[PDB]
Amino acid sequence: DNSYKMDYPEMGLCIIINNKNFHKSTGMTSRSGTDVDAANLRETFRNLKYEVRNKNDLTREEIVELMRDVSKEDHSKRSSFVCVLLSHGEEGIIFGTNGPVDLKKITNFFRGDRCRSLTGKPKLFIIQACRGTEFDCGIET
Amino acid sequence: HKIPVEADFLYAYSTAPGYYSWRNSKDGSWFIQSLCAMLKQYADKLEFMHILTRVNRKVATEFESFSFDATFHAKKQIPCIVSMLTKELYFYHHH
C-alpha cells in the first residue's frame, strides 16, 4: 500500500501543451527551442507507455476547454494522468497564446471530487514556464 | 473513508517561486532536457521523487546561462518539486 497501483490496462494520458508563438500584446517573444522539448517529451512518455497528445499554440480559452474536456473523459482504465505545460508564465500563471490563465483553474478540473475516475490516482503537472522575473545569480562552490 | 480533494497531485515546476526559467533556443529548456534524460535513464528503477531530485541536481549543476547581455549572463536555476502525493510512484510494475 506504499506504491500507487500502476498495473491498470493503460498508464494514462500525457497531455502536452506546446505554446511557441504569442500575440504581440503579451510582449512575449517566440519560445525558440520549445519544439525540441515537445518532441523529447513525446518520445520519453511514449517509452513509458503513455498515450501522448500534443497540442500547439493554444489560446487561454482553448487551454481551459482542452483541460475541461480531458477531465471529463473516463479514466477508469488509466493508472495516472500527466499534463505538461510549455509556455511563458508568472507565479501561479501559465500563458495561452493570447493571455494568462491561472494554473489553479487548470488543475481544479482534476480535483479528487471533480474527476472521479482519477480519484486516488497520481495526477502529474510538469510546468516549464517562468514564475516571476527574479534571477538566481548562484554561489561559487 | 475520504481523502482530501487536493491529494494525489504532483507539480513538477521547472523553477523556484518568483524566478525566471531558462530555455536554450537550440537544445530546449534546461528543465525538460534534464527531466527527459533522467526519466530515460532511471524510470525503469527509481521512484519518481528520486528521479526528480536528480533532475534538480542536473539543472542546478550542469547549466549556467550564457548571454551577450550581461544582465542575463551567468545565471542559475533550481527546479521546484511540489508533492501532494500519498504513495510512491514507479513507472513500471512487477508482474
Binding site: 517573444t29 511563458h88 514556464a129 517562468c130 | 525566471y20 526559467s21 530555455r23 533556443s25 529548456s29 550564457f66
Partner: peptide, 4 residues
Amino acid sequence: DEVX
C-alpha cells in the same frame, strides 16, 4: 539561452 532565453528566459520564459
